[PDB]
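Progress against Task 2.4 (sequence-to-structure conversion) is shown through the following example record, which the project officer requested during the mid-term review.
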Amino acid sequence: GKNKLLNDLRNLIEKANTDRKKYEKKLKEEPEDQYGILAFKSLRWHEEPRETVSDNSERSKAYRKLTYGILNDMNADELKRFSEIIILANEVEDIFNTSITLEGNIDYTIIHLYPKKDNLNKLKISDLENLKNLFEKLLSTKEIISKTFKQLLLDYQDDNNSIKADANKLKLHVKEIVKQIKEKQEESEKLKSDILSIK
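Structure tokens generated for the chain above:
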């Protein structure tokens, strides 16, 4: 049991770390139009110097990279369309800030675990079991949000529930997504804090 857990957990951690490198690469190769994610230009930090997520500060680049992570199952065309749909709903802040916070909890957890992964053998079986279940649950939060965003793109294209024909219906539906993201985001905070508690 211990041997298998050690293995499964290195596999999870090593594989999550590879995905993270993917997102760094999408930032390093980002086109000047930032994959048509015009939403970035409408996210302005409240603290000085009050730049946008579209600007090239270090924290803005980080926020974009976390964006590429949470939208990672989309191509350039789906990325631009996602942005368009959220702008049309006028919910850039609540959708993007919530999503990127969730992603940021995953990212933080991965950088926390990665340097320590050859040291997992200091843990007892029940701690490893707990760690594995927490990390898997953390990764699922992201996967739920990613699927929610992919379905939005399909629902919109199909005009399900008139969300394409009618801005008011889009808005109501996008609000419900905000509610769901916010729950998963809160869930990610606790899973993260529980993983950080294992010492």
